[PDB]
Amino acid sequence: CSVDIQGNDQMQFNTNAITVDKSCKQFTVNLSHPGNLPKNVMGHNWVLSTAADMQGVVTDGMASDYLKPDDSRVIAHTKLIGSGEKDSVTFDVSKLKEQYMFFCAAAHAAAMKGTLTL
Template sequence: MTIKMKNATAMLLTTLLAGPALAATCDVEIEANDAMQFNKSSIAVPASCKQFTVKLKHVGKLPKTAMGHNWVLSKAADAQGVAADGMAAGVDKAYVKAGDARVIAHTKVIGGGEADAVAFDVAKLKAGEAYAWFCSFPGHSSLMKGTLALAK
């Protein structure tokens, strides 16, 4: 085998192996714990995705009545109002005001050892817009929050 053939074979192999790694990932896993923390602070949503799924897992042990968590997405400018209205909505409505048009997506409230997921239409996001996600369980949104952006 010539050096050119070896190089070409190596390049082809590298390209084939890297292919799946370069594909857009249209989901993310986020963990919440009993210390009122998420394990991520930002999410980049590939513009090539049609749907994006957030998988929330509560890795703590406390029940949802004591240390429940959810994941709520809105425009950053709307986050404080969404969180305040969510607290008033109560646990039966997952601390999200019914019919709140400012909410792009949200999970249910989960307790220790539980998980939930939500998928949303990426077309609802606009490039350059600032989005925030947070836990709307009363008192949690000031610590449990992050940013989301539409990536190119």
């Protein structure tokens, strides 16, 4: 009923998929970032929400640890960790049901994009 998640300076997760065994009443995410943060990203966290609400959470974090205080869409999140730092978050699995998304709120990319060629 637990997992170790890691990020790096290439904006990669050690895994982009997490399974929660149904015997679990609580689940714990263990976050660490042993190497450097990505360039000009000064923090790393792990955030859980619905697939629908993810974008809202992200936009509102930049509008207001890159997260809106007491955001009701955020199921669970770690604090912002630096390089070489570590944090854990444990949450009640009862608040879940089903295709949820987890993300880091500190490293942003362009939401809207396309291709151009000559």
